[PDB]
Design a protein around this ligand. Structure first.
Ligand code: NUH
Ligand code: NUH
Lengths: 113, 109
């Protein structure tokens, strides 16, 4: 991978803000389908993603560009919306976090180093 | 007329509006036409590219983030309402990947 201004911003500004959020706790580690008793989870969601995986990826220089990291954030939120019932609280929690994500992405340093 | 909103109009909406998977998203969901009587019960804030495009043309938005939330609502409505295996979900995912790719290069300020 490599280090850019944008990947540093996604790590220190965007992820830090989302991580600490009161609705973040279900998203900080992989969904544990066994523990939650969701035997269909991995049959419906083919690309699991979580902020713990994204954080580790930013720290281990896995990403080559900001867009790749932003795609992982998007997969995490989309997985939640696709799997869960529209009425589930987790959907409202994902939407709240996703709004912060987009607000902070709009303020990201424009040209990548 | 911010730098960011011009980018969202000329780069993002330009790319998404003409995409081969855009046609289901170009106008509001017609629940009667599509036979979806539960659509307006499940989706409380309908959104579509027609509406976003109109809003960009009519200088409705005060910030880029507001236009970005409308795009996000349109995609999220699709993931929440539809079955995981429905083609429309793949089409939404494809458009949204382009949305995020282009937003990654949007100017600051
Ligand atoms: C401790 O972690 C938890 C606890 C409870 C639920 C979830 C959970 C369920 C469904 C879902 O889509 N996500 C993203 C998280 C995660
Ligand atoms: C002519 O317009 C069409 C045609 C077929 C499907 C949809 C459609 C269904 C469900 C849904 O969520 N969306 C966003 C679009 C729209």
């Amino acid at each position: 991978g490599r280090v850019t201004n944008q990947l540093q911003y996604l790590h220190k500004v965007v992820m830090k803000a989302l991580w600490k959020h009161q609705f973040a706790w279900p998203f900080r580690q992989p969904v544990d389908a066994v523990k939650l008793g969701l035997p269909d989870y991995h049959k419906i969601i083919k690309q699991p993603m979580d902020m713990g995986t994204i954080k580790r990826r930013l720290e281990n220089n896995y990403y080559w560009a900001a867009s790749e990291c932003m795609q992982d954030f998007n997969t995490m939120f989309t997985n939640c919306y696709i799997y869960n019932k529209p009425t589930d609280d987790i959907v409202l929690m994902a939407q709240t976090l996703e709004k912060i994500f987009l607000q902070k992405v709009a303020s990201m340093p424009q040209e990548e180093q």
